Structure 1
Amino acid sequence: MEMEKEFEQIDKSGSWAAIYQDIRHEASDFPSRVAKLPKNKNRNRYRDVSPFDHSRIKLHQEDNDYINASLIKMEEAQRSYILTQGPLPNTVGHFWEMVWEQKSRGVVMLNRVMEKGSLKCAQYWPQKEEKEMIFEDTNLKLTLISEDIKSYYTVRQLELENLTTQETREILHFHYTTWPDFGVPESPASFLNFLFKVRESGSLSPEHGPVVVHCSAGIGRSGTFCLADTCLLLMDKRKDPSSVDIKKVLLEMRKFRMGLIQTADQLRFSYLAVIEGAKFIMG
């Protein structure tokens, strides 16, 4: 079925939970043996969210190459994303090592450091120009260059230096700051505006490594971001845009990381975002 009328049909019939449970039943199951080794316990935030072995990002290190991060490679859309958990106190150096090694231009952050009164990720970037951060375990230096605070999101320019080689690179930090502590946003308009700002920066384009996107676990809000982006790109590429099937795209993405889209409300919000976004792209 088309999307916008499939949407009203699920609303009128109140069957979002059943649609979402079907997706959960059909989703791929692949091994995640490296994630579950005892030496990696303090590298995972949640015991039930792990990268598959076949798609995990490897650190360029011979001691321990493990990080909780996955490569989502979308063949028809010609887009790739790295989805990862919010960094932990003992993995902030690994996080920036990955950014460096994978040649990423942008980092997309969809959570606040504190939500619901608890810490959802480490403070992994510097908050003042004159107070830079040094990660001694991976030999990197990180400096805040500029910060632009808007009503729904903040963009930061950061400098990452590899202290072994003295090479430097400019990284863009796109921080969506207004996702509610509970539930999903009422309108997708500010989320879509944010996605378009990430696109306009070059961070999603083939001349760079894959964008790094995270929330707390790296599957819920993060899944919504890449699902909406890929669906909208396919609608621009195909002769028949009404052939784009958001459930089929989601199941393809779940071949590369488990659990993408965590609730039926997040599924409905993803449909809403693609539907409204497709009208703005044209006219």
Structure 2
Amino acid sequence: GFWEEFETLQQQECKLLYSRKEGQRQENKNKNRYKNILPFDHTRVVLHDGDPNEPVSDYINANIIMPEKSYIATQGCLQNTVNDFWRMVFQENSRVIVMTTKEVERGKSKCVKYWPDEYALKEYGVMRVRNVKESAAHDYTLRELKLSKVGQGNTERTVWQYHFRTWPDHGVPSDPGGVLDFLEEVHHKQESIMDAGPVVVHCSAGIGRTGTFIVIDILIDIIREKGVDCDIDVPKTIQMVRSQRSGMVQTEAQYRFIYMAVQHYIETLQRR
């Protein structure tokens, strides 16, 4: 229909109104892993309550992703943004973190370690984190973290870090079963926590693997609500997440993996 075709064209020009100015500020240069991968201003996570000695303390390379449960899509920490990451988790009341990379893959730093070892605690600026217990699953490790603001023990909350460990160094997994099982656990944990904030998801840039995990999670949530017969539109979902953070889902293999994951999920429901 003409209405449909034209509206579709018009929606595609909306992104010309987005800006990425905050991420290009001189003070924020050293807070981006990739100079060309920056958060949209209108969905970026804005950090309040930073060190007043820092001229710019409100910036992290992260965006809120609301399907239209919400998400924060962010890059893996740099050595200098670990304190900022924990400020974000506290402020947003996030209770679940999904780490989709190893710290180092193929000689490259994807994420600086931002958690304490099991049974230890660390202060990251004003934030105190205790690692109470770790559980090693086949494809991932779960770390039960307790996060609080120093001098305010009453603010302590549990943050569950789901660290996916077996994504391959090149390409995507050749079967989606491990990812789906992982995502099912993340889903049940989030739904168990009253007033939990957005689920934090990261990879080195916060777009490729992050986007893949987020898009799969959104689609399987639709299938949970609407059943295996519901309509699914992968391209419209990717367009909706890309309106909130540019570039989500970076490769054709990632794109195919999303399709495979959704179909596998449907078949699991038919088997169970």
- TM normalised by structure 1 equals 0.84
1:115 aligned onto 2:92: no
Distance 1:142 1:240 in 2: 41
CA gap 1:245/1:149 in 2 versus in 1, 3 angstroms? same
User: In 2, are the aligned partners of 1:184 and 1:266 still within 8 Å (CA)?
Assistant: yes
Which stretch has the larger CA shift, 54-63 or 84-93? Answer: 54-63
Q: How far did 1:188 drift?
A: 0.4
User: In 1, are the aligned partners of 2:118 and 2:134 still within 8 Å (CA)?
Assistant: no
User: In 1, are the aligned partners of 2:46 and 2:59 still within 8 Å (CA)?
Assistant: yes
Q: How far did 1:226 drift?
A: 1.1
Structure 1 unmatched runs, 5+: 1-24
Provide the alpha-carbon RMSD of the alignment.
2.0
Displacement over 6 Å in runs of 4+: none
Provide Cα deviations, 1:173-220, integer angstroms capped at 9, x if missing partner: 000000010011010010111101111212687731101100111111
Residue 89 of structure 1: which of 79, 83, 93 is its match?
A: 79
Aligned length: 253
1:46 aligned onto 2:34: yes
Quick one: which amino acid aligns to residue 134 of structure 1?
E
Distance 1:268 1:27 in 2: 27
Identity percentage over the alignment?
Answer: 38
CA gap 1:90/1:248 in 2 versus in 1, 3 angstroms? same
Provide Cα deviations, 1:206-245, integer angstroms capped at 9, x if missing partner: 7311011001111111111111111122233347834211
Quick one: which amino acid aligns to residue 35 of structure 2?
R
Structure 2 unmatched runs, 5+: 1-11, 51-55
User: In 1, are the aligned partners of 2:31 and 2:80 still within 8 Å (CA)?
Assistant: yes
Distance 2:146 2:187 in 1: 20
User: In 2, are the aligned partners of 1:27 and 1:251 still within 8 Å (CA)?
Assistant: no
SS at match of 2:197: coil
SS at match of 2:70: strand
Residue in structure 2 matched with residue 146 of structure 1 by the alignment: 133
Provide Cα deviations, 1:145-182, integer angstroms capped at 9, x if missing partner: 00011221100101112114222111100000000100
Residue 156 of structure 1: which of 143, 151, 158 is its match?
A: 143
Residue in structure 2 matched with residue 37 of structure 1 by the alignment: 25
Residue in structure 2 matched with residue 16 of structure 1 by the alignment: none
User: In 2, are the aligned partners of 1:234 and 1:241 still within 8 Å (CA)?
Assistant: no
Which stretch has the larger CA shift, 232-241 or 264-273? Answer: 232-241
Quick one: which amino acid aligns to residue 122 of structure 2?
M
1:66 aligned onto 2:59: yes
Distance 2:217 2:181 in 1: 12
Provide Cα deviations, 1:11-39, integer angstroms capped at 9, x if missing partner: xxxxxxxxxxxxxx989452110000111
SS at match of 1:41: helix
Provide Cα deviations, 1:71-110, integer angstroms capped at 9, x if missing partner: 01113xxx31100000000000000010000001111000
Distance 1:256 1:26 in 2: 14
Name the structure, 1 or 2, with higher relative contact order (CA <8 Å, separation 6+): 1
Distance 1:162 1:206 in 2: 20
Residue in structure 2 matched with residue 125 of structure 1 by the alignment: 115
CA gap 1:26/1:242 in 2 versus in 1, 3 angstroms? farther
Distance 1:242 1:115 in 2: 38
